[PDB]
Amino acid sequence: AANDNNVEWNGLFHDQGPLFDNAPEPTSTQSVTLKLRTFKGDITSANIKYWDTADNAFHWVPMVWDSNDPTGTFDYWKGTIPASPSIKYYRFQINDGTSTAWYNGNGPSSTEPNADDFYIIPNFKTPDWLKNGVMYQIFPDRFYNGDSSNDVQTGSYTYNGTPTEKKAWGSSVYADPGYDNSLVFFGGDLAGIDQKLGYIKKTLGANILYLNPIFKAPTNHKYDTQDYMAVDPAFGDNSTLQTLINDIHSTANGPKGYLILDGVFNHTGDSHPWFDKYNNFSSQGAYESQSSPWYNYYTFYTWPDSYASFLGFNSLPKLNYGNSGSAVRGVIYNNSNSVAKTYLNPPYSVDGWRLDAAQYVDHQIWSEFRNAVKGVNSNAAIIGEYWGNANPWTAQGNQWDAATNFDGFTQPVSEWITGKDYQNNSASISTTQFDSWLRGTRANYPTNVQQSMMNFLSNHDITRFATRSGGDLWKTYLALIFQMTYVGTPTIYYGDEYGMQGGADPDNRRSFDWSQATPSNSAVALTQKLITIRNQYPALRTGSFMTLITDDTNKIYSYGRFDNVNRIAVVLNNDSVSHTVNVPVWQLSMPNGSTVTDKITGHSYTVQNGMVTVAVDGHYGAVLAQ
Ligand SMILES: [Ca+2]
Ligand SMILES: [Ca+2]
Ligand SMILES: [Ca+2]
């Protein structure tokens, strides 16, 4: 490159990783020094242009030449945005004489963008353990039966005229004729989770557990809460929960762990005493009388049978949060003994809440909720359920730390690798489309939020990845290599690590086959290897992300994860045959003559003419680190 009236887009880079931003989670008094990469000698000037919410105006900061990279291929330019408490948004103007390019979260543009600016949100922190962790999601009835004494039996109780059914471990999840799918119980419990902490924390290496609901409720899924304050007896008691939490937190039995609970705060069950549709309590619920002590906890359109609910399910009546200081806001979060606080305080001290159905609870309520949660424990995580762009609950730093990454992770991964959407409908995307989808969805979020997103291949509300993949376990390998090297918390839905299959609910909640929970299962062996690799390299958790190859002919995707210390080129082959790939590691400033090691195999390579040449099997990958 040269000063030649032309900005060369291929040389340009910025994100908020360590090489480019010295303060990605600044306080009010920390200035933000930003670096923009270009090809060496390519440009004549560059400017940071930032919107300041303090004065509703743009501000321009001229940049200066900072340095070359070690390979001598690139310049870095630098400039500093001043310290203050205000939210700010920035982009770059990049000039080479009569040529101008713009650059922001969406990359380069010939025209000035007005969306996808980078974020500066002073004093907004997400928990660093969430950014750096690996999460394991457990649907408790189906993971491990640690104790038969608490098992629900066939006919133990009835709910809305149907008896419960016990089914044998490993059998079909579908209720036998006459029974109901939501009242089928395999016997998994908290004691079982406790007994399997060595599998989770050592055999795999995950350090965060996320549980589907565990509080008293008549169904097997327990999203129809009857008592927020009691562990459901099928799963244990509150003392079992305390013991489980202390064993999760222990550093003596594996890495220090964290527990995130499912907070079902949009709605209760229809059998909650506040509602009491079936008169299970002496008290009078909202369904029973318009003079009920809890009548105003719900919203009736025509009392008693037409009321607000989750998605039209009459079993899930929607809570009326009223306005600030209301009784409902009190019992859920404000009161010293609220549901949200109770589990965050001793003797529980859980590490976060996953917010079920969170889009149906307004932004004011989530802002108050954040204050309640973070006031007890500033390092307790708040992850909202949302299937789209969760910017409205994340990008001002006043509500959630992150969201369930359906839109930025689960869907594009599904469509690229399996050719199906996550509901197993036909929907395929190319490698260029995959890369574009990923970039646009990252750009929806502040960097800390991106790094804290819950990135799962499957969950309890979508079809299993291994079913979408038609049973080809190598598609799971590929998905795992991507998952464990991408931006956001890798989240393993129990069983995905061994290739568990399953269609739509309830078949996505099969009982876990413990014969497969060893490194003799090749997917488990790869999962363990990848978690070890992710835990070795901060660049994989909090590093920059740069696209390197998007090859739609050979179905090759390559990207770099890199920081001040490490440079890692991930190379993924989404074809059904091997490809030998020339990896442009020069883009990551890996020097000529240096060595890289594929951390999956231990195979070593030498960088030549900016390239590493590696053979990658179909539906597999290499993780080329130095
Ligand atoms: Ca130039
Ligand atoms: Ca049990
Ligand atoms: Ca009653």
Helix extents (H) in 107-237: 128-131, 190-195, 197-198
Determine the Cα–Cα distance for residues 559 and 587; give it in Å rounded to an integer: 10
Q: How close is the Cα of 156 to the center of ligand 2, in Å?
A: 14
Query: Which distant-in-sequence residues (6+ apart) come within 8 Å of 198 by Cβ?
Result: 253, 254
What are 571's strand-pairing partners? 558, 622
How big is the CA angle at 314 (ends 309 and 319), to the nearest 5 degrees? Answer: 35
Determine the Cα–Cα distance for residues 410 and 382; give it in Å rounded to an integer: 19
- Cβ contact 480:434 at 8 Å: no
Q: How close is the Cα of 135 to the center of ligand 2, in Å?
A: 23
| DSSP for residue 538 | H
Domain 537-626: top CATH class: mainly beta
What are 13's strand-pairing partners? 37
Query: What's the start-to-end Cα distance of the chain, in Å?
Result: 27
DSSP 341-366: HHHHSTTT---EEEETTGGGS-HHHH
What are 104's strand-pairing partners? 107
Q: How close is the Cα of 306 to the center of ligand 3, in Å?
A: 19
Residue 602 class from Cβ within 10 Å (0-12 exposed, 13-18 middle, 19+ buried)? exposed
Binding-site residue numbers are 2, 4, 6, 42, 96, 145, 147, 150-151, 187, 189, 267, 276, 280-281, 283, 288, 354, 460-461, 505, 509
Q: 125-536 domain in CATH 3.20.20.100?
A: no
Ligand nearest to the CA of 142: 2
1-124 CATH pick, 2.60.40.10, 1.10.340.30, 3.30.10.20, 2.60.120.330: 2.60.40.10
Determine the Cα–Cα distance for residues 609 and 272; give it in Å rounded to an integer: 68
Say yes or no: do domains 1-124 and 537-626 share a fold: yes
Binding-site residue numbers for Ca(2+) are 2, 4, 6, 42, 96, 145, 147, 150-151, 187, 189, 276, 280-281, 283, 288
Amino acid identity, position 609:
N
Q: How far is CA 439 from the centre of its chain?
A: 16
Each residue of 264-290: b (16+ CB within 10 Å) or e?
bbbbbbbbbbbbbbbeeeeebbbbbee
431 phi-psi bin (left φ>0, alpha ψ -120 to 50, beta other): alpha
Determine the Cα–Cα distance for residues 438 and 406; give it in Å rounded to an integer: 11
Determine the Cα–Cα distance for residues 568 and 457; give it in Å rounded to an integer: 23
Determine the Cα–Cα distance for residues 278 and 496; give it in Å rounded to an integer: 38
Q: Beta strand pairing status for 352-355 and 258-263?
A: parallel
Ligand nearest to the CA of 145: 2
Residues with CB in 5 Å of ion ligand 3? 276, 279, 281
- Cβ contact 433:524 at 8 Å: no
Ligand nearest to the CA of 101: 1
196 phi-psi bin (left φ>0, alpha ψ -120 to 50, beta other): alpha
Q: How close is the Cα of 109 to the center of ligand 2, in Å?
A: 58
Q: Please give the method by which this entry was determined.
A: X-ray
What are 622's strand-pairing partners? 571
Altogether, the residues listed in the chain come to a count of 626
Q: How close is the Cα of 160 to the center of ligand 3, in Å?
A: 15
DSSP 44-95: SEEEEEEEETTTTEEEEEE-EEEEE-TTSSEEEEEEEEPP-SS-EEEEEEEE
Determine the Cα–Cα distance for residues 186 and 224; give it in Å rounded to an integer: 18
| In the chain, domain spans | 1-124, 125-536, 537-626
- What positions carry a catalytic annotation? 356, 385
Each residue of 111-146: b (16+ CB within 10 Å) or e?
eeeeebbbbbbbebebbebbbbbbbbbbbbbbbbbb
Structure tokens at 180: 């109901």
Determine the Cα–Cα distance for residues 58 and 114; give it in Å rounded to an integer: 12
Query: Which distant-in-sequence residues (6+ apart) come within 8 Å of 189 by Cβ?
Result: 140, 141, 144, 145, 146, 147, 150, 234, 235, 236, 240
Nearest to 298 by CA among 340, 262, 269: 269
Q: How close is the Cα of 233 to the center of ligand 3, in Å?
A: 21
